[PDB]
Design a protein around this ligand. Structure first.
Ligand SMILES: CCCCCCCCCCCCCCCCCC(=O)OC[C@H](COP(=O)([O-])OCC(O)COP(=O)([O-])OC[C@@H](COC(=O)CCCCCCCCCCCCCCCCC)OC(=O)CCCCCCCCCCCCCCCCC)OC(=O)CCCCCCCCCCCCCCCCC
Ligand SMILES: CCCCCCCCCCCCCCCCCC(=O)OC[C@H](COP(=O)([O-])OCC(O)COP(=O)([O-])OC[C@@H](COC(=O)CCCCCCCCCCCCCCCCC)OC(=O)CCCCCCCCCCCCCCCCC)OC(=O)CCCCCCCCCCCCCCCCC
Ligand SMILES: CCCCCCCCCCCCCCCCCC(=O)OC[C@H](COP(=O)([O-])OCC(O)COP(=O)([O-])OC[C@@H](COC(=O)CCCCCCCCCCCCCCCCC)OC(=O)CCCCCCCCCCCCCCCCC)OC(=O)CCCCCCCCCCCCCCCCC
Ligand SMILES: CCCCCCCCCCCCCCCCCC(=O)OC[C@H](COP(=O)([O-])OCC(O)COP(=O)([O-])OC[C@@H](COC(=O)CCCCCCCCCCCCCCCCC)OC(=O)CCCCCCCCCCCCCCCCC)OC(=O)CCCCCCCCCCCCCCCCC
Ligand SMILES: CCCCCCCCCCCCCCCCCC(=O)OC[C@H](COP(=O)([O-])OCC[N+](C)(C)C)OC(=O)CCCCCCCCCCCCCCCCC
Ligand code: HEC
Ligand code: HEM
Ligand code: HEM
Ligand SMILES: COc1cc2[nH]c(C)c(-c3ccc(Oc4ccc(OC(F)(F)F)cc4)cc3)c(=O)c2cc1Cl
Ligand SMILES: [Mg+2]
Lengths: 88, 243, 360, 92, 96, 205, 33
């Protein structure tokens, strides 16, 4: 029944100016995704391994949604830690 | 089924007890709604007069309202007509009824966004994540036309196409546009639109909770004042011991 | 009536060792007062017409001066009504207060049922998705009783006629409750209150000023916590789906009632039979009522002190409290075979603890 | 272990000592009570209930106004740059 | 109220209505007693609370340890075991 | 009163004349005035000095007594079970109690070398006292312990400052805060009663 | 007992007990027996 629920101990970040204003015409998520992809590598491997087990089955059953969801959730949580530093 | 994942906590300014809305960002999010989202979504509870003195000045709101054609009547002959909009009019809706909306969106109904941040779990954090969660499908999942894969939407299969893409509108204040900037701005606008009385509510609460707390201290002292006369009392049986 | 006022609120004598566990009866009463004041005020601008009810609440918040304050205070205070009652009832089970305050216990149980019914009626009025679908379900658990449903609604479904009559009943029942509070107090002051140690004693003092100032101190905390939650929204007491208009042909993904109804809603969910689940409901109320006659269930003479202090076997009321908490968690979860297994484990404790309270 | 144990529980020796401490005939806050009593607020404003109630209503009227004004200033300082009046809108 | 053999009054003046509840709980002071009380205007009334803080806190917390804390830790542990079996049961049925 | 007793027969809770629960050893005085001599010639445990919980006297009562399913408390004394027509005769040689029905409906009080009027005069309840009575039962001298503080530690005596001005400034401050709270709630109620923001605008044209 | 007017609660006691014996006997015959 509320638009939002207030929180305690939130860290409000400081804006990081760019070098060339034209640099921020691309989504600054691209700069943070590689580093966040390496820290969630424990799930990158569980997904690649589940694809092989499904590609080998004879019948047309099986999927990798479970491992895929966990992987990309890990990355989004890593990006949120710093994304607002580059947004006005 | 399973429990959907909890969205991450983004540091929105309004989340603190002592903070207000960020009006410069609310302004930019209203441009995003008008030029992208309003093509499929209505906000039937909002009126142009709600923006005056809180987001935009009066003369600017008039110019925006007049750019629309609004139906009014009946006239002296019992007929309907159209005229430019005024401050008293509601935000224009793209479809007349729900059946017409589904017909134009493959059977799916785009919901009204007048209370959207109060109508979903986790509210603004969910909306921010949703808008940047479109991915290619995983191995073994094939979707039919009209459906798209999203990390945060329950079931993963959503009927809304990706609404945002880098470089598509030009803000008026010169802020460079990108998918992440537009997401943060449109969320701020929709949070304000869910309850424009949020700032009045929070500022009154600070004055009240602080006053009540001080009175609670005073009543504690007045209670202990009377507690001590019976906590330090002496009662002797038989004979008097000490004075 | 001023001689009654001074006899019962000024010169009434009380044991010196009272503490805050004996202050929550006053707090509940004050919550009723606040609800009556804010409720009547909301009624001046509410519309029972189903086609316009949902809109009248929003317009009240968005357009009317101070409209947000009366709406949010009424919703928050309702949660504090049930928290105070729960602490109030638990004190009695810890001290075996029903041993000699028999009619006070029974009268209280009637007040509890009246408050449950009032809250259920009020939650349907805003006429959102959870209003409609929660009433449809909770009114079907009573289907085993013949024809107890189609008449309360006056139609073939929770239609627009049900909403008009839930408004009148919701208006009326609180004032009936105020009548029964008078009986409650009659039966209490007939015997006099107990104390935390469970002994008779002649070390008593007058209510005013010593004990009156403790009630006042607790009132301050209550008003401050209500306003804190109401004006800032720290906890999530309401469900978001009720901010969506009713749709009769689309069920929401997760149906769950308010927190103060969750535990028993979970018990009824882990029992597959529909008739056996309602019998479980009656047996629980019957057990609570039978405690009024605990003196007669065994020829050994009972004592009020139950010796939970430093005791490793704990007490039955404590074990019940944790089983209730455990079920609130189950009730808020998506159905899953594993959740159902543990939910049945806790249901056994939830029920057995009640039954063994009648043994000593 | 004595804490919580019905076979051994007793206060340690350092708690029995705290109960024996004595501060009889000492008052470190006395200079504060002397200042209050020298203003004669009791003789002129609190000894008579009619005047006591004049003091309540009058002081409450003025204090409530200063309290609101102060909180509004704090609110504006914490939120500098985010409120409507702080960012004039520029027309195209 | 009090038992009948305690409610019996020594005097004969009538009970006034504002005092009906006082005399419904009359109790005889078997053996007698001597009472001394000081005016609250001549007492320190906050220092006594803190002077006895450690003793009062020990008494209360010691009483509650076994009966409340020990069942709470067990309930907390069961909550974790439950959540660990739910996750494993989801992967044994839906994950490949 | 509004409370009834529960004196009835019971097949599981046998009568006290057969299962007493309490420790059934009692002394017996010829005339209750003799107990005053017992109280001045016997020693009391509370007059000895002990320092550790482990040195406290051990009760003569046994902890093994009440049994049953879900019976949390394990020690009791008294019960209201009805006594039969012909109760068991107390054995005075073992210290058993004789009182109530066990005096009226048994021959426990007969003495071959005394008149009946003399013998039965020694069987009133004031004539019996449980073993351990004089050594144990406390009789306090005050509510207050010498190990605890009282008003002597906290009293403001000569040389002290007057507190009246502070006590009444405390209460007055609470009231001008509570008065402001009330005035604000009433002003908000009146605003709610007045016209709304949507209708004030419609009037302007 | 003789001397007081608490005359309804003893009736409530016997009705409640009887009701409980019937609820838990109707469930056993459906699950066990
Ligand atoms: C500075 C930097 C910042 C830090 C500082 C802090 C900053 C924050 C702000 C400042 C905060 C402090 C300010 C100063 C405060 C001064 C006042 C103060 O100390 O207050 C305490 C003071 C205590 O009273 P007291 O007279 O001193 O002593 C009473 C005795 O304790 C009564 O005992 P008794 O022996 O006489 O009676 C016996 C029995 C009689 O029974 C009762 O009295 C009733 C029942 C009491 C128990 C309550 C629990 C049962 C209810 C459950 C509710 C479930 C909710 C459902 C929702 C669940 C959702 C999941 O009661 C009990 O048994 C009571 C003991 C309970 C102990 C509980 C032990 C819990 C153990 C947990 C173990 C966990 C293990 C797992 C760990 C995992 C992680 C490792 O209370 C008040 O003065 C009350 C004022 C407020 C009134 C209430 C208004 C709000 C209503 C909502 C809250 C309800 C609860 C309120 C407490 C109730 C107490 C009974
Ligand atoms: C976390 C939140 C909770 C609050 C904070 C934590 C709680 C403690 C705070 C400190 C207060 C106590 C200070 C020591 C005792 C003072 C009295 C006294 O006798 O002392 C001398 C006494 C020995 O002196 P003596 O020579 O024997 O006797 C001298 C007297 O004649 C003896 O005469 P008497 O015994 O008859 O009494 C003398 C009398 C006379 O006292 C005076 O001197 C008169 C003073 C007049 C003013 C009264 C205070 C009013 C303040 C209201 C707020 C400001 C309003 C103004 C505008 C503000 C605008 C921003 O004392 C009073 O009336 C005490 C006044 C102070 C009340 C406490 C105020 C605390 C809150 C302050 C801020 C307001 C709340 C926040 C809301 C606002 C902001 C958002 O020593 C002690 O009592 C032992 C001291 C050790 C105890 C302190 C332990 C502190 C640590 C435990 C707490 C830890 C945190 C919480 C843990 C639990 C939750 C997790
Ligand atoms: C093919 C598979 C078949 C599976 C089915 C099961 C088949 C079992 C076959 C077993 C065959 C061999 C054994 C035969 C034994 C026969 C005993 C008998 O009849 O009594 C003779 C004989 C009868 O003579 P009596 O003169 O009547 O003596 C009675 C005593 O005086 C009594 O009084 P007392 O004063 O001497 O004792 C003190 C008294 C009083 O003590 C107290 O009050 C103290 C209590 C302290 C508690 C402190 C707790 C603190 C910690 C709390 C932790 C947190 C919890 C809360 C948080 C929760 C959060 C969610 O203690 C009690 O009341 C003990 C309570 C025992 C409760 C056990 C209940 C288990 C129920 C299991 C479920 C059943 C189905 C349920 C319904 C399902 C849906 C339809 O009794 C004895 O001599 C004593 C024997 C006692 C034995 C008890 C344990 C038996 C366990 C059997 C095995 C069960 C296995 C189940 C799982 C199987 C999985 C495959
Ligand atoms: C005054 C000074 C101040 C200034 C002036 C103030 C002015 C205002 C004052 C008023 C002025 C106007 C006069 C008003 C007169 C009102 C009548 C009156 O005074 O009568 C007192 C009169 C006592 O007179 P007395 O002179 O004190 O003693 C009578 C004897 O001489 C001696 O009898 P005893 O001592 O041996 O025992 C007496 C005992 C006798 O106790 C009983 O017989 C038990 C009564 C309660 C039973 C229900 C409690 C829960 C039990 C467990 C669940 C059972 C379920 C059913 C199945 C059972 C198994 C088959 O009674 C009590 O304990 C008293 C309880 C208070 C009842 C008051 C209710 C009045 C009617 C309004 C009811 C509204 C209900 C709304 C809430 C529900 C909405 C859905 O009370 C009664 O005997 C009437 C009992 C009525 C019971 C109604 C129960 C309704 C609810 C049942 C449960 C339904 C659950 C369904 C769930 C469905 C879920 C979907
Ligand atoms: C007609 C009534 C007033 C209505 C209009 C005014 C607005 C109402 C809002 C409050 C305004 C402030 C109160 C007025 C000032 C009173 C001062 C006065 O004369 O008092 C004498 C005195 C003043 O304090 P004193 O006792 O120190 O004064 C002694 C006398 N002198 C100082 C002059 C030497 O107060 C008392 O006697 C106090 C009695 C105990 C009351 C404690 C109050 C706490 C309340 C706890 C119970 C909860 C109540 C809620 C009930 C709800 C029921 C539904
Ligand atoms: C037509 C091309 C659309 C545009 C442009 C926008 N939205 Fe939309 N939206 C559309 C449909 C058909 C749906 C239904 C999806 C389904 O599978 O049912 C939606 C849904 C939403 C939602 C609800 C999400 C939920 O959890 O239910 C939101 C919050 C939403 N849309 C927001 C939104 C925003 C911010 C837009 C501008 C950036 C926007 N939409 C544009 C159709 C269309
Ligand atoms: C103990 C007393 C009361 C309780 C527990 C109670 C409870 C509730 C609850 C839970 C709601 C729903 C709130 C929401 O989610 O929006 C509600 C709404 C409402 N109540 Fe009350 N109520 C009480 C007394 C009253 C009284 C006495 C009246 C009128 C005389 C009243 C009038 C209303 C109205 C008009 C609404 C609809 C407005 C809304 O939903 O916000 N209430 N009540
Ligand atoms: C509107 C609801 C209720 C109100 C207003 C209310 C009010 C009160 C008040 C003021 C007291 C005396 C102060 C106190 O002990 O807290 C009291 C005592 C008592 N109440 Fe309640 N009560 C309510 C509900 C209940 C319920 C639900 C029960 C039990 C099911 C109950 C049982 C008792 C008992 C047994 C006492 C006496 C406690 C004792 O002295 O040991 N009451 N009530
Ligand atoms: C040992 O200590 C206790 C035992 C207790 N036992 C019981 C049975 C209850 C109780 C009574 C009535 C009730 O009413 C109900 C509302 C709603 C429903 O249905 C549904 F679905 F939840 F809405 C069912 C029922 C819900 C719960 C208690 O409060 C209770 C409290 C304490 Cl302290
Ligand atoms: Mg008994």
């Amino acid at each position: 029944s509320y638009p939002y629920y207030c929180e305690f101990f939130v860290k409000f970040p400081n804006y990081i100016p760019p070098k060339d204003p034209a640099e921020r015409l691309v989504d600054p998520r691209q700069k943070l995704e590689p580093g966040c992809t390496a820290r969630c590598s424990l799930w990158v491997n569980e997904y690649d391994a589940c694809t092989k087990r499904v590609r080998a089955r004879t019948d047309n059953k099986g999927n990798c949604s479970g491992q895929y969801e966990e992987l990309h959730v890990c990355i989004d949580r890593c990006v949120a830690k710093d994304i607002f530093k580059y947004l006005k | 089924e399973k429990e959907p994942p909890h969205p991450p906590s983004y540091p929105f300014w309004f989340k603190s007890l002592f903070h207000s809305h960020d009006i410069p960002s609310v302004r930019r999010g209203y441009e995003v709604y008008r030029k992208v989202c309003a093509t499929c979504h209505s906000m039937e509870q909002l009126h142009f007069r709600h923006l005056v003195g809180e987001v935009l000045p009066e003369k600017r709101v008039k110019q925006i309202a007049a750019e629309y054609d609004v139906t009014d009547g009946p006239n002296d002959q019992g007929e309907m007509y159209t005229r430019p909009g005024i401050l008293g009019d509601a935000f224009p809706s793209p479809y007349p009824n729900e059946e017409a909306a589904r017909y134009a969106n493959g059977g799916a109904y785009p919901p009204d966004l007048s209370l959207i941040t109060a109508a979903r779990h986790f509210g603004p954090d969910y909306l921010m994540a949703l808008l940047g969660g479109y991915r290619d499908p995983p191995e073994g999942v094939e979707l039919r036309p009209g459906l798209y894969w999203n990390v945060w939407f329950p079931g993963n299969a959503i009927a809304m196409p990706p609404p945002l893409m880098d470089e598509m509108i030009d803000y008026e204040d010169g802020t460079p546009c990108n998918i992440s900037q537009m997401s943060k701005d449109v969320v701020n606008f929709l949070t304000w639109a869910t309850e424009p009385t949020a700032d009045e509510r929070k500022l009154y609460g600070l004055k009240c909770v602080s006053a009540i707390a001080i009175g609670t201290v005073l009543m504690t002292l007045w209670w202990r004042f009377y507690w001590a006369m019976y906590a330090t009392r002496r009662i002797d049986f038989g004979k008097l011991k000490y004075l | 009536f001023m001689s009654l006022f001074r006899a019962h609120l000024v010169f009434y004598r009380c044991a010196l060792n009272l503490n805050s566990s004996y202050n929550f009866g006053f707090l509940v009463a004050m919550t009723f007062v606040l609800q009556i004041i804010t409720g009547i005020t909301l009624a001046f601008r509410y519309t029972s017409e189903a086609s316009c009810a949902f809109a009248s609440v929003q317009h009240l918040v968005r357009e009317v001066a101070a409209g947000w304050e009366f709406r949010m205070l009424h919703a928050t205070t309702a949660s504090f009504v049930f928290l105070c009652i729960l602490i109030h009832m638990t004190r009695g089970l810890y001290n075996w207060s029903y041993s000699y305050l028999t009619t006070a216990w029974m009268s209280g149980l009637v007040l509890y049922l009246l408050t449950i019914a009032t809250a259920f009626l009020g939650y349907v009025l805003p006429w959102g998705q959870m209003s409609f679908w929660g009433a449809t379900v909770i009114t079907n658990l009573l289907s085993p009783i013949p024809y107890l449903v189609p008449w309360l609604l006056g139609g073939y479904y929770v239609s627009d006629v049900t909403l008009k009559r839930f408004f009148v009943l919701h208006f009326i029942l609180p004032f009936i409750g105020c009548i029964i509070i008078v009986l409650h107090i009659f039966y209490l002051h007939l015997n006099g209150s107990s104390n935390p140690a469970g002994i008779d004693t002649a070390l008593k003092v007058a209510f005013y000023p010593h004990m009156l100032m403790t009630d006042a101190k607790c009132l301050s905390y209550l008003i401050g916590l209500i306003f804190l939650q109401a004006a800032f929204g720290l906890m999530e007491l309401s469900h978001p789906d009720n901010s969506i208009p009713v749709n009769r042909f689309v069920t929401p993904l997760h149906i769950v009632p308010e927190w103060y109804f969750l535990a028993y809603y979970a018990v009824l969910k882990v029992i597959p039979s529909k008739t056996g689940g309602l019998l479980v409901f009656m047996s629980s109320l019957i057990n609570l009522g039978l405690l009024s006659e605990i003196r007669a269930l065994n020829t050994r003479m009972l004592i009020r002190q139950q010796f939970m202090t430093r005791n490793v076997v704990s007490g039955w009321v404590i074990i019940w409290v944790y089983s209730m908490i455990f079920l609130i968690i189950i009730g808020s979860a998506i159905p899953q075979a594993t959740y159902i297994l543990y939910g049945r484990l806790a249901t056994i404790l939830y029920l057995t603890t009640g039954l063994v309270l009648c043994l000593y | 272990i004595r804490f919580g144990n019905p076979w051994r529980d007793d206060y340690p020796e350092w708690i029995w000592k705290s109960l024996r401490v004595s501060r009889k005939d000492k008052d470190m806050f006395a200079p504060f009570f002397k200042l209050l009593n020298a203003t004669k607020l009791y003789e002129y404003c609190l000894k008579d209930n009619r005047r006591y109630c004049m003091f309540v209503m009058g002081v409450g009227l003025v204090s409530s106004w200063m309290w609101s004004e102060w909180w509004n200033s704090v609110w504006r300082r914490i939120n500098k740059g985010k409120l409507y009046n702080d960012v004039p809108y520029v027309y195209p | 109220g009090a038992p009948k053999f305690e409610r019996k009054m020594l005097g004969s003046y009538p009970v006034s209505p504002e005092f009906e509840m006082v005399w419904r709980d009359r109790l005889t002071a078997h053996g007698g007693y001597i009472q001394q009380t000081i005016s609250p205007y001549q007492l320190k009334f906050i220092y006594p609370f803190w002077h006895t803080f450690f003793a009062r806190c020990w008494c209360k917390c010691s009483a509650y340890a076994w009966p409340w804390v020990w069942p709470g830790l067990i309930t907390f542990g069961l909550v974790k075991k439950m959540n660990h079996d739910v996750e494993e049961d989801i992967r044994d049925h839906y994950w490949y | 009163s509004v409370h009834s007793h529960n004196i009835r027969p019971d097949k599981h809770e046998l009568p006290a004349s057969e299962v007493p629960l309490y420790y059934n050893r009692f002394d017996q005085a010829d005339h209750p005035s003799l107990w005053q001599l017992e109280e001045e010639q016997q020693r009391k445990h509370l007059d000895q000095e002990v320092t550790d919980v482990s040195q406290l006297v051990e009760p003569v009562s046994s902890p093994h007594q009440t049994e049953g399913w879900f019976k949390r408390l394990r020690y009791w004394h008294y019960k209201e079970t009805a006594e039969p027509t012909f109760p068991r005769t107390p054995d005075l040689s073992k210290g058993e109690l004789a009182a109530g029905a066990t005096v009226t409906r048994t021959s426990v009080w007969h003495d071959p070398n005394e008149p009946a009027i003399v013998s039965v005069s020694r069987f009133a309840p004031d004539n019996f006292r449980a073993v351990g009575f004089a050594e144990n039962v406390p009789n306090p001298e005050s509510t207050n312990s010498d190990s605890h503080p009282d008003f002597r530690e906290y009293r403001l005596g000569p040389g002290s400052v007057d507190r009246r001005p502070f006590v009444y400034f405390m209460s007055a401050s609470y009231f001008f805060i509570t008065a402001s709270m009330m005035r604000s709630f009433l002003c908000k109620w009146v605003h709610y009663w007045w016209v709304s923001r949507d209708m004030l605008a419609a009037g302007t044209t | 007992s003789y001397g007081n007017g608490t005359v309804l609660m003893p009736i409530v006691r016997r009705v409640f007990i009887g009701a409980l014996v019937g609820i838990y006997a109707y469930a056993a015959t459906d699950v066990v027996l």
